[PDB]
Design a protein around this ligand. Structure first.
Ligand SMILES: Cc1cc2nc3c(=O)[nH]c(=O)nc-3n(C[C@H](O)[C@H](O)[C@H](O)COP(=O)(O)O)c2cc1C
Ligand code: SF4
Ligand code: SF4
Lengths: 430, 180
């Protein structure tokens, strides 16, 4: 927590404690680990107190946005106009680099349910829906068992946990779509239509599920909120830097000696994270071509930037990237960056819903151009054209999947233009 | 309705019309991403009598009029603004003609009566304006109805009316008779 240096989180400071499933993930173990401890008191203290405590903690939103959780929760209507309020937890975790939410759902089901109760009380939501990926059948079974147990002991329902508050929780599951993780597309999917995002000028707080005020929040934020109210906002604020306070779950994947999911305070150096928890890059730190810091949506960073880069939101913004999700992907010198970025372009071509013209057409265009560059078929001017197309897509789409499709290609052009030129020239030369 | 779905830009005008206005709810965008397609997933035929309006609503010719197919171009046609006698709504229409032939009929804007919509009968009944037409006066004889001049037919009508008197003369007006 020291302002000079951050890292080396201790076990006493970790929110997610059975993250590795060494213990009973269900209610017996959960009560013994500090779950559902004094939920009566925290909920009874009123929605205003919870909102102010979350605001003081500095908790930004996990899931990619990074938007302050307290302000978003405070946007919810205070008094009913005849329309109920809903809490929807985005447990859809489709993202090419992120595995972190699945461990929480399968090994800490009860923390998520307690967080749903706390946040629904904070936003005055009568009912709650936990959206889960359809592929996560077993994780959904774990969450459903947790919900049933909480209902059985009266932790949920009318007079939930003994406080004069009423909250009902449901578990809903999709059929597989990366777009259904977006706030409006998730609402459309749960309503019963195709998961196509809604134009934002109507905002979900104003009109959401069934036309009623709703808030969509990630599993990790909902899970961290109850212990923030228990442990204290100052404890949460101490660990990270300014504006970036809390601990976050980092999922190291790729060419590392040990791929691990771990909890660490934010503002750890990326080199420190990879070397201590992941065991170092396969073949040593010398053996680095690039690192994708925040899952596949954000632009990649070259080794040189990875030397001094710090695992934070604003700093990765300064490094022309972002910590959307703590899904760090490591590539060796052996790796062909062109082919991996082309596979990400194919991913985005497959995951576009097709609603708006720029995403639906330009993402397939991007995939075709990246495929030609993977073989050297293209010309040297094709790279500049590719940058222009990425600029054409960005900002002119309904949701951010166009931006998430444009960014990896832009990062490849920006930091690894030399290799593309090499491949194009050599194919012509040979 | 003729279909060229390759020309289809994925607006949702046909689906929104079929749902909100026509109310048959037959068309939808099936698929995700670039291979998303518009139309009935099953082989179905559009049942509404307002079906012709999707053709006008279609901006990019993916939905086109099968009766008016490959027959003319837009610049070749002279448009005259008239009304539809198909029913008592009096839908305001624009009749496009090449020479002495009516080529197509399309609606006009009149928020009072027909917002901008036309029924299928009115839109596609111009085909029956070229068939079974009466061109000359006909007077009956032992050989049947035969060609006659206007004077001879009027003479026969005069000889017939001379016999009848008062209520023996009877008039029946049709569906398409005009005020004058
Ligand atoms: C294409 C797309 C996919 C997304 N997928 C997810 C996802 O799988 N999980 C998630 O938590 N957020 C996802 N998001 C971000 C959503 O906005 C999310 O519901 C919201 O940011 C949660 O807000 P929070 O940060 O306060 O938790 C996605 C966004 C977009 C544009
Ligand atoms: S950007 Fe892509 S995924 Fe998002 S609404 Fe447009 S077409 Fe659909
Ligand atoms: S109105 Fe025409 S262009 Fe639009 S979706 Fe229907 S067929 Fe395609």
């Amino acid at each position: 927590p020291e302002k000079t240096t951050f890292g080396g989180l201790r076990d006493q400071d970790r929110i997610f404690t059975n993250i590795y499933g060494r213990h009973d993930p269900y209610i017996k173990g959960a009560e013994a680990r500090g779950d559902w401890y004094m939920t009566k008191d925290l909920v009874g203290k009123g929605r205003d107190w919870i909102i102010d405590q979350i605001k003081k903690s500095g908790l930004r939103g996990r899931g990619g946005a990074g938007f302050a959780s307290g302000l978003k929760w405070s946007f919810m209507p205070k008094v009913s106009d005849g329309r109920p309020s809903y809490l929807v937890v985005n447990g859809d975790e489709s993202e090419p680099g992120t595995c972190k939410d699945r461990e929480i759902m399968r090994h800490e089901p009860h923390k998520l349910v307690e967080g749903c109760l706390v946040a629904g009380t904070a936003m005055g939501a009568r009912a709650g829906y936990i959206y889960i990926r359809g592929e996560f059948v077993n994780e959904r079974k774990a969450v459903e068992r947790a919900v049933a147990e909480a209902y059985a002991k009266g932790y949920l329902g009318k007079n939930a946990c003994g406080s004069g508050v009423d909250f009902d929780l449901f578990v809903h599951y999709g059929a597989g779509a990366y777009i259904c993780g977006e706030e409006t597309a998730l609402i459309e999917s749960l309503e019963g239509k195709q998961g196509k995002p809604r134009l934002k000028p109507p905002f979900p707080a104003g009109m959401g599920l069934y036309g009623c005020p709703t808030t969509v929040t990630n599993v990790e934020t909902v899970a961290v909120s109850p212990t923030i109210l228990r442990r204290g906002p100052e404890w949460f604020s101490s660990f990270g830097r300014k504006n970036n306070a809390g601990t976050k779950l980092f999922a190291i994947s790729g060419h590392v000696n040990r791929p691990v999911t771990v909890e660490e305070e934010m503002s750890i150096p990326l080199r420190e994270l990879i070397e201590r928890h992941a065991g170092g890059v396969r073949g040593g730190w010398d053996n680095l071509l690039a690192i994708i810091p925040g899952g596949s949506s954000v632009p990649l960073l070259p080794k040189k930037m990875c030397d001094d880069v710090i695992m934070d939101f604003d700093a990765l913004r300064t490094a022309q990237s972002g910590l959307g999700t703590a899904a760090v992907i490591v590539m060796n010198k052996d790796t062909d960056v062109i082919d991996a970025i082309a596979r990400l372009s194919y991913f985005y071509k497959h995951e576009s819903c097709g609603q708006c013209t720029p995403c639906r057409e330009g993402t397939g265009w991007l995939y075709d151009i990246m495929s030609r560059m993977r073989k050297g078929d293209a010309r040297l001017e094709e790279i500049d054209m590719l940058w222009e197309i990425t600029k054409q897509i960005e900002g002119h789409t309904i949701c951010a999947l166009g931006d998430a499709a444009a960014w990896p290609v832009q990062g490849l052009i920006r930091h690894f233009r030399s290799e593309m030129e090499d491949r194009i020239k050599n194919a012509d030369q040979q | 309705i003729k279909t060229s779905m390759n020309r289809c830009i994925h607006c949702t005008r046909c689906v929104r019309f079929t749902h909100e206005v026509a109310g048959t709810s037959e068309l939808g965008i099936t698929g995700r991403g670039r291979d998303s397609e518009v139309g009935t997933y099953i082989e179905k035929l559009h049942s509404s009598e307002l079906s012709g309006n999707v053709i006008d609503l279609c901006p990019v010719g993916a939905l086109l009029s099968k009766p008016y197919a490959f027959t003319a171009r837009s610049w070749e046609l002279k448009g005259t603004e008239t009304i539809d006698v198909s029913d008592a709504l009096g839908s305001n229409i624009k009749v496009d003609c090449r020479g002495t032939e009516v080529m197509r009929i399309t609606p006009r804007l009149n928020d009072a009566i027909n917002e901008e919509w036309l029924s299928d009968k009115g839109r596609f009944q111009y085909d029956g304006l070229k068939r079974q037409r009466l061109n000359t006066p006909l007077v009956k004889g032992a050989k049947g109805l035969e060609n006659a001049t206007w004077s001879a037919a009027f003479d026969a009508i005069r000889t017939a009316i001379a016999g009848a008197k008062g209520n023996e003369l009877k008039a029946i007006a049709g569906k398409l008779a005009d005020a004058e």
